[PDB]
């Protein structure tokens, strides 16, 4: 059958499996002629019924739409005479990767630089009416040259800029638990750009704490951890939180006080970084800071000013003896 | 055949289904019921 | 050439894939509108938006500039196209719901094979397979801009009467069904062609903006009065070749 616009994946030669996913999920590979490094991501279809996953279709549609210095880049869509493969520009590391490796060091100036790219990338995708809906350190890659790239739009979708009329009804159970904001845990279905800024807030802390600050085991345990950290979820700090169905039908400690800047005080130190982490991890979406303001917040415009990730990337060594000698 | 605001997002667009059933009557008005009756009735096009 | 990928010359439309398999020009052109009718039928049955329909058609039209009606019966292809189109325009319908309405329309006579038989399950796959071929043939390019956008926008701008408005939008739905302009001109121009036409019929001469541009200059900058007359004449001749033009 003719197929002028969907090349065989043979043009690329597989070199390695990226991570511990399934048999042939994600592959590191190179273009046989230009040697260009790419990452092959197989469109998974073990669940076959509604034909090509509408989730895969949303990914593709969104990725083909989003072109920005800080958004992973889809090169092309290939096939094997059957599987469909998304081909991206290869990025050497992922933020979750660097953060876990406590032997890799982050200067204050370099963290400012990572948050700036992350938020400039988020400003972009929201601007283009898209919600990421799966922000976490693992979906944030960083290229060998120090450029941050938002990745994993497998759960993204478009949203409507309707300040005007009717209420939107978007899928509610989204965003990995440890990074899910309150509004979604309380049953919110008409959400927006703020669910990603919450996630941008957890990843920011992890920049210093080196690991997820709120590891709930359940939805109720998560809200719990959030109340014990941000303060209790009340109509005083978050007006109308009452209305939510589950607001009542859910255990909900009510005496808790905000301890954000305290609990993190140990790790972070710099005042401006504390203030931002404070304005990002705000319970009421309508009051939670956004990418536009976060970017203009003093943290980014005060000494030390943001720097490139050259240093931080040199602390990432080739092996044992380099790391331990 | 009926103007829909393009400004509305995809999921916010009304169903195409015509309000009333399609009749077998041929006439300037029954031929202009919907977009199927106009293509089939008035212009005489059919897929089967 | 990426933006010019799905736009063809009168010659290219002539040397189609269906042509290379002995199908005749007006033979092809009919399958197109036929397919476009089936799509408009099932789509109103399933109550998928007009937009889901228009997109299903543009997939159709492009699918047949690479593939031939010979090998892919426009009645097999149309269900799959609409199936995929549903998801794409965020109003998905269940594979089964569709295999139903597709059967009601191509076989009002018979009755739906058992949801357990070999023939049923069998076809549920043929549809799925086809959607995979439609996806690879369109090169996975799914976002379709339609004439209806620029049409609405423009009428609102010239304060066209309710009747001219509806009529211009009606002609854009038809240019999709009847002509292949979708494969030759950008949506904004086709929208201009539809307003220029509904205007002839209304004998309305849209006023020329105070010491300046003509109405079509607020819809597209490459449009010329000469073009709009040629394409309008071209659209009408198409309308004159339809079957019924030959309570
Ligand atoms: N362009 C890329 N370059 C290098 N590694 C990549 C690239 N894209 C994805 N990866 C790796 O694949 C993992 C991301 O997979 P991802 O794109 O998020 O699909 P996912 O299924 O949603 N996540 P996962 O379940 O971990 O595979 C990342 O955490 C990276 O380690
Ligand atoms: Mg991921
Ligand atoms: Zn009708
Ligand atoms: Zn009648």
XYZ file of C-alpha atoms and ligand atoms in Angstrom:
654
model
C 0.000 0.000 0.000
C 1.210 3.536 -0.737
C 2.476 5.631 2.154
C 4.479 8.692 1.041
C 3.987 10.487 4.338
C 4.721 7.881 7.017
C 8.239 6.510 6.845
C 9.424 3.142 8.067
C 11.230 3.310 11.383
C 14.165 1.571 9.668
C 15.686 4.919 8.774
C 16.536 4.916 12.481
C 18.825 2.367 14.092
C 17.912 1.388 17.668
C 20.707 1.797 20.171
C 19.191 1.325 23.631
C 16.063 1.164 25.761
C 15.459 4.338 27.696
C 14.309 3.324 31.171
C 12.511 0.272 32.555
C 9.181 0.365 30.784
C 7.695 -2.492 28.752
C 9.412 -4.664 26.094
C 9.666 -2.084 23.291
C 8.315 1.130 24.826
C 10.956 3.903 24.528
C 14.184 3.607 22.520
C 17.268 5.711 22.033
C 18.157 5.666 18.345
C 20.013 7.444 15.546
C 19.237 8.495 11.981
C 21.298 6.215 9.719
C 22.314 9.092 7.439
C 22.553 12.259 9.560
C 23.262 10.481 12.805
C 20.682 12.673 14.497
C 19.880 11.426 17.997
C 16.179 10.808 18.517
C 13.958 8.986 20.999
C 11.462 6.489 19.625
C 8.299 6.170 21.689
C 5.963 3.375 20.670
C 2.274 4.202 20.631
C 0.989 1.553 23.037
C -2.129 -0.414 22.138
C -2.627 -3.461 24.373
C -6.114 -2.087 24.965
C -7.665 -2.343 21.528
C -11.342 -1.508 21.107
C -11.765 2.146 20.269
C -9.082 1.687 17.649
C -6.149 4.113 17.726
C -6.261 5.555 21.290
C -7.941 8.968 21.402
C -5.247 9.668 23.973
C -2.479 9.036 21.424
C -4.365 11.206 18.962
C -4.474 14.062 21.470
C -0.791 13.740 22.098
C 0.069 13.930 18.409
C -2.393 16.733 17.703
C -0.965 18.780 20.654
C 2.710 18.031 19.928
C 2.297 18.989 16.290
C 0.802 22.234 17.494
C 3.382 23.136 20.161
C 6.777 24.340 18.905
C 8.901 26.111 21.555
C 12.470 26.145 22.970
C 11.099 24.546 26.129
C 8.651 21.954 24.741
C 9.891 18.523 23.626
C 9.948 18.372 19.844
C 8.168 15.723 17.793
C 10.249 15.239 14.590
C 7.946 12.831 12.737
C 5.623 9.838 13.078
C 6.949 6.568 11.715
C 5.682 3.034 11.341
C 6.900 -0.538 10.968
C 5.278 -2.463 8.108
C 2.278 -3.133 12.989
C 3.440 -0.266 15.188
C 3.272 3.520 15.242
C 6.327 5.358 16.618
C 6.620 8.947 17.814
C 10.104 10.288 17.077
C 11.456 13.170 19.235
C 14.729 15.005 19.494
C 16.749 13.110 22.064
C 17.415 14.776 25.439
C 20.195 13.297 27.568
C 18.565 13.614 31.024
C 15.319 14.013 32.889
C 14.970 16.238 35.946
C 13.804 13.386 38.158
C 17.019 11.593 37.148
C 19.394 14.393 38.162
C 17.530 15.158 41.410
C 17.712 11.606 42.710
C 21.415 11.425 42.038
C 22.504 13.333 45.166
C 26.039 13.380 43.758
C 24.903 16.008 41.186
C 25.078 19.544 42.576
C 22.702 22.468 41.920
C 23.811 26.067 42.623
C 21.126 28.657 43.506
C 21.751 30.430 40.256
C 21.263 27.190 38.251
C 17.973 26.349 39.955
C 16.742 29.804 39.076
C 17.613 28.910 35.519
C 15.736 25.601 35.577
C 12.539 27.152 37.005
C 12.716 29.947 34.452
C 12.724 27.527 31.503
C 10.058 25.309 33.083
C 7.735 28.296 33.638
C 8.456 29.863 30.219
C 7.538 26.542 28.693
C 4.332 26.467 30.741
C 3.456 30.022 29.781
C 3.728 28.852 26.200
C 1.497 25.804 26.309
C -1.177 27.582 28.359
C -1.053 30.470 25.972
C -1.964 27.897 23.254
C -4.877 26.732 25.401
C -3.359 23.401 26.456
C -3.202 21.853 29.937
C -0.236 19.575 30.570
C -1.969 17.596 33.316
C 1.034 15.466 34.326
C 3.765 17.760 35.622
C 6.485 16.029 37.654
C 10.256 15.863 37.690
C 10.166 12.795 35.423
C 8.378 14.532 32.579
C 10.907 17.387 32.436
C 13.921 16.610 30.272
C 17.122 18.630 30.002
C 19.346 18.385 26.944
C 23.095 17.893 27.073
C 23.355 21.629 26.223
C 21.350 22.731 29.248
C 17.975 23.388 27.691
C 14.856 22.367 29.526
C 12.016 20.713 27.631
C 8.549 19.859 28.895
C 7.669 16.320 27.837
C 4.974 13.655 28.034
C 1.830 15.153 26.547
C 0.104 11.804 26.771
C -2.436 13.285 29.164
C -2.626 16.816 27.741
C -5.800 18.218 26.208
C -7.085 21.576 25.106
C -9.175 23.839 27.317
C -11.567 26.709 26.698
C -10.853 30.345 27.571
C -14.478 30.836 28.664
C -14.627 33.507 31.430
C -17.971 33.978 29.767
C -20.671 31.306 29.831
C -21.113 27.625 30.641
C -19.057 25.342 32.929
C -16.555 22.911 31.426
C -16.467 19.239 32.319
C -12.946 17.883 31.947
C -11.752 14.465 33.143
C -11.142 14.884 36.874
C -8.801 12.036 37.822
C -5.626 13.377 36.231
C -2.104 14.366 37.283
C 0.051 11.925 39.248
C -1.145 11.894 42.837
C 1.959 13.284 44.574
C 1.676 16.403 42.383
C -2.083 16.745 42.120
C -3.426 20.084 43.367
C -6.375 20.337 45.879
C -9.156 21.410 43.507
C -8.790 18.106 41.637
C -8.730 15.958 44.801
C -11.956 17.683 45.949
C -13.707 16.679 42.711
C -13.116 19.769 40.507
C -13.936 19.209 36.807
C -13.793 22.763 35.445
C -10.070 23.371 36.029
C -7.303 25.177 34.174
C -3.666 26.372 33.983
C -3.346 26.440 37.792
C -3.235 22.636 38.099
C 0.096 22.771 36.325
C 1.406 25.627 38.407
C 0.775 23.583 41.534
C 2.834 20.797 39.964
C 5.464 23.429 39.077
C 5.495 24.211 42.820
C 6.232 20.631 43.977
C 9.013 20.254 41.420
C 10.489 23.524 42.676
C 10.782 22.289 46.249
C 12.270 19.053 44.994
C 14.955 21.261 43.497
C 16.222 21.559 47.093
C 14.574 18.725 49.073
C 15.719 16.260 46.404
C 12.454 14.290 46.475
C 8.606 14.513 46.443
C 7.444 16.600 49.401
C 3.993 14.990 49.523
C 3.928 11.282 48.944
C 0.308 10.346 49.658
C -0.816 6.710 49.406
C -4.407 7.642 48.755
C -6.420 10.612 47.598
C -7.460 11.210 51.227
C -3.903 10.829 52.471
C -2.748 13.318 49.838
C -5.226 16.061 50.838
C -4.079 15.218 54.330
C -0.415 15.884 53.557
C -1.442 19.100 51.764
C -3.400 20.329 54.794
C -0.547 19.488 57.130
C 1.751 21.541 54.881
C -0.281 24.406 53.407
C -2.861 24.887 56.128
C -6.344 23.425 56.518
C -8.697 23.660 53.529
C -11.288 26.217 54.751
C -13.752 28.714 53.109
C -11.756 31.444 54.786
C -8.554 30.990 52.822
C -10.269 29.378 49.814
C -13.757 30.977 49.380
C -16.604 28.652 48.472
C -14.554 25.520 48.944
C -17.856 24.611 50.615
C -19.726 23.856 47.396
C -17.572 20.854 46.486
C -19.563 17.636 46.880
C -16.720 15.711 48.512
C -15.854 18.697 50.708
C -17.921 17.168 53.493
C -17.948 13.441 52.616
C -14.142 13.440 53.022
C -12.115 13.344 56.202
C -10.478 16.750 56.392
C -8.338 17.929 59.311
C -9.472 21.466 60.166
C -6.999 22.945 62.651
C -3.845 22.876 60.498
C -1.836 26.037 59.838
C 0.353 26.951 56.845
C 3.920 25.761 57.438
C 5.265 25.923 53.874
C 8.144 28.374 54.342
C 8.931 26.689 57.677
C 9.088 23.047 56.674
C 11.204 24.052 53.676
C 13.200 26.746 55.486
C 15.823 24.109 56.271
C 16.466 23.188 52.602
C 15.844 26.294 50.489
C 17.281 29.235 52.499
C 17.037 32.077 49.949
C 13.982 34.303 50.811
C 12.820 34.877 47.248
C 12.771 31.155 46.443
C 10.717 30.584 49.586
C 8.186 33.266 48.677
C 7.635 31.825 45.187
C 7.301 28.239 46.435
C 4.838 29.819 48.842
C 2.780 31.547 46.098
C 2.785 28.457 43.858
C 1.571 26.035 46.560
C -1.618 27.951 47.290
C -4.817 26.031 47.913
C -7.302 28.239 45.994
C -6.494 28.016 42.251
C -7.853 31.526 41.710
C -5.194 32.795 44.126
C -2.327 30.546 43.101
C 0.301 32.474 41.112
C 0.633 31.894 37.333
C 3.537 31.635 34.863
C 3.404 35.253 33.890
C 3.801 36.524 37.453
C 5.982 33.676 38.647
C 8.467 34.647 35.863
C 8.516 38.274 36.940
C 8.836 37.483 40.658
C 12.044 38.778 42.306
C 13.494 35.267 42.546
C 14.437 35.593 38.902
C 15.535 39.177 39.122
C 17.838 39.294 42.121
C 21.349 38.106 42.897
C 22.451 35.635 42.018
C 20.957 36.031 38.553
C 20.076 32.847 36.571
C 23.038 31.021 34.957
C 23.446 28.237 32.394
C 23.498 24.583 33.418
C 27.106 23.911 32.381
C 28.436 23.475 35.893
C 25.566 21.369 37.170
C 25.954 19.117 34.138
C 29.662 18.493 34.750
C 28.882 17.119 38.244
C 27.078 14.346 36.395
C 29.951 11.845 36.006
C 30.628 8.820 33.805
C 30.781 6.204 36.584
C 31.614 4.903 40.066
C 35.267 5.899 40.499
C 34.715 9.411 39.060
C 31.805 9.797 41.448
C 33.598 8.314 44.446
C 37.279 9.206 43.978
C -26.572 24.455 6.708
C -27.242 26.271 10.019
C -24.517 28.801 11.119
C -22.528 27.729 14.222
C -20.145 30.076 16.123
C -16.600 29.004 15.082
C -15.364 30.588 18.292
C -16.795 27.670 20.300
C -14.334 24.885 21.048
C -14.862 21.437 19.372
C -16.543 19.715 22.317
C -18.865 22.738 22.701
C -20.332 22.333 19.199
C -24.013 21.265 18.825
C -24.980 17.941 17.238
C -25.699 17.905 13.503
C -28.836 15.741 13.924
C -31.855 17.618 12.517
C -34.555 18.581 15.074
C -37.300 16.743 13.143
C -37.244 13.407 11.312
C -36.479 13.305 7.598
C -39.626 12.941 5.469
C -39.898 11.312 2.021
C -41.773 14.359 0.685
C -40.163 16.117 -2.278
C -40.814 19.844 -2.309
C -38.928 23.109 -2.008
C -39.307 22.901 1.783
C -38.885 19.164 2.384
C -35.906 19.304 0.031
C -34.354 21.912 2.314
C -34.974 20.152 5.618
C -31.336 19.395 6.402
C -28.059 18.888 4.572
C -28.932 15.277 3.697
C -32.340 16.048 2.253
C -30.836 18.815 0.150
C -28.011 16.691 -1.220
C -30.223 13.682 -1.821
C -33.639 15.208 -2.666
C -32.845 18.480 -4.513
C -29.537 17.435 -6.164
C -30.424 13.754 -6.410
C -27.251 12.293 -4.926
C -27.142 8.968 -3.083
C -24.429 6.608 -1.822
C -26.240 3.282 -2.110
C 5.912 22.146 0.389
C 4.666 21.053 3.817
C 1.908 23.686 3.695
C 1.520 22.984 0.014
C 1.360 19.266 0.667
C -2.416 18.964 0.435
C -3.068 21.465 -2.353
C -2.981 20.372 -5.992
C -2.989 21.725 -9.550
C -5.850 21.083 -11.974
C -3.445 18.634 -13.629
C -2.669 16.781 -10.423
C -6.363 16.440 -9.696
C -6.591 14.929 -13.196
C -3.770 12.412 -12.784
C -5.291 11.034 -9.572
C -4.656 7.524 -8.102
C -8.195 6.547 -9.133
C -7.374 7.623 -12.672
C -4.382 5.277 -12.857
C -6.840 2.436 -12.276
C -9.156 3.294 -15.141
C -11.629 5.381 -13.155
C -12.999 8.335 -15.080
C -12.899 11.993 -13.929
C -16.639 12.493 -13.394
C -16.776 8.954 -12.116
C -14.318 9.896 -9.377
C -15.910 13.282 -8.679
C -19.158 11.453 -7.982
C -17.711 8.965 -5.491
C -16.364 12.013 -3.650
C -19.760 13.639 -3.194
C -21.353 10.255 -2.617
C -18.855 9.513 0.157
C -19.474 13.033 1.447
C -23.232 12.305 1.614
C -22.839 9.023 3.505
C -20.571 10.888 5.921
C -23.160 13.622 6.345
C -25.834 10.961 6.920
C -24.139 8.798 9.552
C -22.861 11.971 11.139
C -26.352 13.331 11.731
C -27.495 9.885 12.865
C -24.732 9.753 15.525
C -25.346 13.449 16.113
C -21.635 14.335 15.648
C -21.170 18.131 15.228
C -21.131 19.713 11.767
C -17.439 20.280 12.378
C -16.893 16.530 12.938
C -18.555 16.004 9.523
C -16.538 18.623 7.599
C -13.306 17.150 8.969
C -14.388 13.602 8.109
C -14.863 14.855 4.496
C -11.493 16.637 4.204
C -9.909 13.377 5.399
C -11.899 11.612 2.639
C -10.812 13.998 -0.142
C -7.131 13.823 0.788
C -7.233 10.133 1.380
C -8.151 9.841 -2.296
C -5.303 11.898 -3.714
C -2.948 9.195 -2.476
C -5.229 6.130 -2.603
C -7.678 4.899 -5.286
C -11.434 4.217 -5.016
C -10.565 0.991 -6.874
C -8.807 -0.481 -3.842
C -10.680 1.418 -1.125
C -14.441 1.522 -1.596
C -15.633 4.920 -0.468
C -18.277 3.152 1.668
C -15.734 1.212 3.683
C -13.534 4.264 4.062
C -16.281 6.722 5.035
C -17.228 5.001 8.328
C -13.582 4.807 9.470
C -12.952 8.419 8.463
C -15.942 9.599 10.528
C -14.919 7.325 13.409
C -11.474 8.903 13.583
C -12.964 12.377 12.954
C -15.098 12.070 16.069
C -12.149 11.648 18.444
C -10.216 14.355 16.628
C -12.995 16.918 17.031
C -13.642 15.833 20.677
C -17.051 14.136 20.240
C -15.983 10.487 19.928
C -18.525 7.750 19.331
C -18.042 4.118 20.299
C -16.690 1.813 17.641
C -19.870 -0.229 17.980
C -22.305 2.701 17.905
C -20.653 3.533 14.534
C -20.522 0.015 13.082
C -24.271 0.189 13.692
C -25.177 3.464 11.967
C -22.791 2.490 9.168
C -24.836 -0.672 8.732
C -28.213 1.062 8.968
C -27.177 3.217 6.014
C -25.542 0.711 3.692
C -27.990 -2.088 4.565
C -31.375 -0.822 5.799
C -32.684 -4.181 4.590
C -30.696 -6.814 6.499
C -30.248 -6.747 10.261
C -27.122 -6.259 12.390
C -25.076 -9.480 12.551
C -24.739 -10.844 16.100
C -22.272 -8.918 18.252
C -20.649 -12.336 18.699
C -20.603 -13.782 15.182
C -17.358 -14.096 13.219
C -18.531 -11.621 10.593
C -19.262 -8.917 13.172
C -16.009 -9.145 15.111
C -14.317 -9.573 11.739
C -15.535 -6.201 10.441
C -14.934 -4.443 13.753
C -11.328 -5.091 12.742
C -11.674 -3.998 9.123
C -12.834 -0.625 10.419
C -9.949 -0.463 12.909
C -7.458 -1.440 10.193
C -8.796 1.182 7.788
C -8.418 3.924 10.407
C -4.770 2.916 10.643
C -4.406 3.307 6.878
C -6.286 6.594 6.849
C -3.921 7.824 9.596
C -0.787 6.823 7.679
C -2.091 8.155 4.383
C -2.923 11.596 5.778
C 0.561 11.377 7.282
C -1.036 11.722 10.716
C -1.847 15.371 9.954
C -5.181 15.791 11.685
C -5.895 19.486 12.198
C -8.319 20.835 9.596
C -9.189 24.516 9.187
C -12.565 25.012 7.499
C -14.179 27.730 5.303
C -16.993 28.155 7.834
C -14.653 30.032 10.131
C -13.761 32.803 7.710
C -17.357 32.840 6.460
C -18.987 33.561 9.813
C -16.260 36.061 10.750
C -16.743 37.921 7.418
C -20.528 38.157 7.430
C -20.444 39.558 10.976
C -18.010 42.162 9.617
C -20.162 43.397 6.733
C -23.265 43.174 8.902
C -24.736 40.873 6.276
C -28.440 40.156 6.835
C -29.360 36.954 8.670
C -30.303 35.435 5.340
C -27.014 36.231 3.587
C -25.168 34.940 6.619
C -26.905 31.557 6.711
C -26.688 31.275 2.942
C -22.931 31.934 2.849
C -22.399 29.311 5.554
C -24.673 26.950 3.636
C -22.542 27.320 0.528
C -19.385 26.482 2.436
C -20.875 23.207 3.626
C -21.587 22.427 -0.018
C -18.255 23.376 -1.450
C -17.022 20.556 0.831
C -19.614 18.081 -0.441
C -19.681 19.081 -4.127
C -16.317 20.578 -5.170
C -12.758 19.683 -4.394
C -11.850 23.324 -3.707
C -10.777 21.925 -0.324
C -7.818 20.430 -2.223
C -7.082 23.514 -4.325
C -7.685 26.655 -2.285
C -7.049 27.781 1.264
C -10.170 27.879 3.492
C -10.194 31.696 3.591
C -10.479 31.925 -0.209
C -13.183 29.270 -0.381
C -15.058 31.294 2.288
C -14.734 34.338 0.027
C -16.069 32.326 -2.909
C -19.115 31.331 -0.838
C -19.947 34.937 0.184
C -19.403 36.313 -3.326
C -21.936 33.724 -4.491
C -24.658 34.072 -1.858
C -24.329 37.778 -2.748
C -24.978 37.362 -6.472
C -28.168 35.569 -5.585
C -29.091 38.395 -3.194
C -27.962 40.953 -5.813
C -26.135 42.696 -2.978
C -22.996 44.664 -3.803
C -20.984 44.874 -0.546
C -19.875 48.531 -0.183
C -16.187 49.282 -0.717
C -14.603 50.391 2.568
C -14.204 54.189 2.665
C -11.444 55.085 0.182
C -9.938 51.612 0.437
C -10.211 47.842 0.436
C -12.945 45.572 -0.898
C -14.754 43.168 1.436
C -12.657 40.142 0.418
C -9.593 42.058 1.532
C -10.719 41.588 5.115
C -10.919 37.835 4.532
C -7.805 37.173 2.493
C -5.089 39.209 0.821
C -4.440 36.987 -2.243
C -8.073 37.069 -3.417
C -8.897 39.128 -6.532
C -12.274 39.984 -8.075
C -11.214 37.968 -11.149
C -10.697 34.809 -9.090
C -14.003 35.051 -7.232
C -15.836 35.244 -10.584
C -14.001 32.253 -12.046
C -14.463 30.077 -8.983
C -18.104 31.113 -8.631
C -18.729 30.189 -12.268
C -16.796 26.981 -11.588
C -18.912 26.149 -8.553
C -22.172 26.737 -10.426
C -21.177 24.475 -13.319
C -20.556 21.740 -10.779
C -24.051 22.376 -9.392
C -25.384 22.117 -12.940
C -24.014 18.607 -13.373
C -25.643 17.068 -10.317
C -28.192 14.280 -11.080
C -31.413 16.323 -10.807
C -29.919 18.818 -13.249
C -29.378 16.572 -16.248
C -47.057 17.344 3.346
N 13.081 12.966 23.882
C 13.499 12.144 24.815
N 14.853 11.934 25.001
C 15.291 11.095 25.957
N 14.525 10.385 26.823
C 13.149 10.620 26.605
C 12.579 11.450 25.662
N 11.203 11.448 25.719
C 10.983 10.628 26.690
N 12.133 10.082 27.286
C 12.270 9.123 28.423
O 10.981 8.414 28.561
C 10.437 8.732 29.863
C 9.252 9.514 29.450
O 8.382 8.827 28.849
P 7.204 9.664 28.539
O 7.489 10.454 27.355
O 6.898 10.580 29.668
O 5.964 8.697 28.242
P 5.155 8.142 29.515
O 4.677 6.837 29.188
O 3.988 8.973 29.759
N 6.085 8.121 30.837
P 6.673 6.641 31.180
O 5.595 5.777 31.760
O 7.764 6.766 32.207
O 7.219 6.006 29.940
C 11.056 9.923 30.451
O 10.981 10.084 31.850
C 12.455 9.873 29.804
O 13.351 9.204 30.671
Mg 6.250 10.446 31.775
Zn -33.783 16.007 6.389
Zn -43.234 18.860 2.057
